[PDB]
Design a protein around this ligand. Structure first.
Ligand code: A1ICW
Length: 335
C-alpha cells in the first residue's frame, strides 16, 4: 500500500480510526503543519501533538504511537473513551487546532471544510406567529431504527412534526395553538461527517445498547432534494471516502476503518498496525449489517474532491518543526 498504521497501546477505541480519517483529509493536514507551535510546550500542547502524529504517519516505515497525544488532551480515567462519542473526540481535536490558526494565513480552514447551516422552525396554523432559529453544524446524527437506508434517514430528518391537542404549542401572547414544527438545510459543507445512531437507550435495563440492524449507504449520494434552494452550478452530489466500523459488545469489541484515500474507489483496510488492500464490497456492503458494521460515514462533495484531496510533499512541512522532531527522535535512541 505504502500507507502506515497506528499502534494499539491501550483502550483508545475509535481513536486510531478517527486519526487516519483526518490525516487523509489532505487539505486539513497541510494547514495543521502550518501552525506556529515553535514556542508551545512539548507535553501539554494538543496542536503540537497532532503535528507529530501526522508527520510520523507521513514519514515512518514502522507503526506509529500516540501516548503523547492521549496525554495532551487528558483522557486518562478508566472510562474516558467508553463514556464519549466519536464526534466529541473530533470536536476536542479540531477546536484546539482552529484556535491555534487564528491570526495566520490559514485561519478559518476548519469552518471552510466542515461547517454547514440549518434552520429549525415552528409555525402556527390558525394564527400569525412563526419562530425561526438558525444554527451552524459540524456533523449530523442520523436515525437508523426503522430505516432501510440513508435516503430514508434524511426524509425522516426533514419531517414535519405535528402539534395537536395535549401536544399543542404555547405561542405566548396567543396561548395554546396548533402548529407545524420542522427542520431544513440551507447548506451542506465540502466534507460531510455523518454519525449513525446505533447506541440507544434500553428501557428494559435502564442502559444504552447497540443495534445491529441492516442499514444501506451508497457510494454516491445526491442530496439536492433536501436543500431549501438548489444551484445548477454546484449540485449536492457526494462521494464516499471513509467507513468507520465496529464489531462486538462491552465484553469484546474491535474498531477498524476502511478508506479510499485518493477518492478513486481503491479501498484499504486500516486495523491498528496492519494496513492492507481490500475490495469495494468489503468496505461498503459487508458493513450494512442485518457483528461488523458502520457507525460513521465520511462523504466529500464532488466539486471539491481535488481541492480537499490535494497532494502533499515533504516540502509542505516547515524546517523549524522538522528540526524539533529530529531532536526528540535522537533522545528516543535509548534502545
Ligand atoms: O465506541 C462507542 C461506544 C462506546 C461504548 N460501547 C459499549 C461500552 C458499554 C459498556 C457498558 C455498558 C454498555 C456499553 C458501545 C460503543 C458503540 C459502538 C458502535 C455503535 C454504538 C456504540 N462509540 C463511538 C461511536 C458512536 O459515537 C456512534 N454514535 C454517535 N452518535 C450517536 C448519537 C446518538 C445516538 C447514538 C450515537 C452513536 O452510536 C457511539 C459511541
Amino acid at each position: 500500500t505504502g500507507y502506515v498504521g497506528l499502534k494499539n497501546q491501550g483502550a483508545t477505541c475509535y481513536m486510531n480510526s478517527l486519526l487516519q480519517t483526518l490525516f487523509f483529509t489532505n487539505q486539513l493536514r497541510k494547514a495543521v503543519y502550518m501552525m506556529p507551535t515553535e514556542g508551545d510546550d512539548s507535553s501539554k500542547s494538543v496542536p503540537l501533538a497532532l503535528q507529530r502524529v501526522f508527520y510520523e504517519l507521513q514519514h515512518s516505515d514502522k507503526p506509529v504511537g500516540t501516548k503523547k497525544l492521549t496525554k495532551s488532551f487528558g483522557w486518562e480515567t478508566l472510562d474516558s473513551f467508553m463514556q464519549h462519542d466519536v464526534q466529541e473526540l473530533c470536536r476536542v481535536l479540531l477546536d484546539n487546532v482552529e484556535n491555534k490558526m487564528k491570526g495566520t494565513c490559514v485561519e478559518g480552514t476548519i469552518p471552510k471544510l466542515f461547517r454547514g447551516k440549518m434552520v429549525s422552525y415552528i409555525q402556527c396554523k390558525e394564527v400569525d406567529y412563526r419562530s425561526d432559529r438558525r444554527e451552524d453544524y459540524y456533523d449530523i446524527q442520523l436515525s437508523i431504527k426503522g430505516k432501510k437506508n440513508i435516503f430514508e434517514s434524511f426524509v425522516d430528518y426533514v419531517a414535519v412534526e405535528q402539534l395537536d391537542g395535549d401536544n399543542k404549542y404555547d405561542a405566548g401572547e396567543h396561548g395554546l395553538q396548533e402548529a407545524e414544527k420542522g427542520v431544513k438545510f440551507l447548506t451542506l459543507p465540502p466534507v460531510l461527517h455523518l454519525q449513525l445512531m446505533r447506541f440507544m437507550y434500553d428501557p428494559q435495563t435502564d442502559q444504552n445498547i447497540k443495534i445491529n440492524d441492516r442499514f444501506e449507504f451508497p457510494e454516491q449520494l445526491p442530496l439536492d432534494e433536501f436543500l431549501q434552494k438548489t444551484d445548477p452550478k454546484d449540485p449536492a452530489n457526494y462521494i464516499l471516502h471513509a467507513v468507520l466500523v465496529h464489531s462486538g459488545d462491552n465484553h469484546g469489541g474491535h474498531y477498524v476503518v476502511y478508506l479510499n484515500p485518493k477518492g478513486d474507489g481503491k479501498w484499504c483496510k486500516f486495523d491498528d498496525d496492519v494496513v492492507s488492500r481490500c475490495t469495494k464490497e468489503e468496505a461498503i456492503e459487508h458493513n450494512y449489517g442485518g457483528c461488523t458494521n458502520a457507525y460513521m460515514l465520511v462523504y466529500i462533495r464532488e466539486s471539491k474532491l481535488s481541492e480537499v484531496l490535494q497532494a502533499v510533499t515533504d516540502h509542505d512541512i516547515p524546517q523549524q518543526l522538522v528540526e524539533r522532531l529530529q531532536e526528540e527522535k535522537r533522545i528516543e535512541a535509548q534502545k
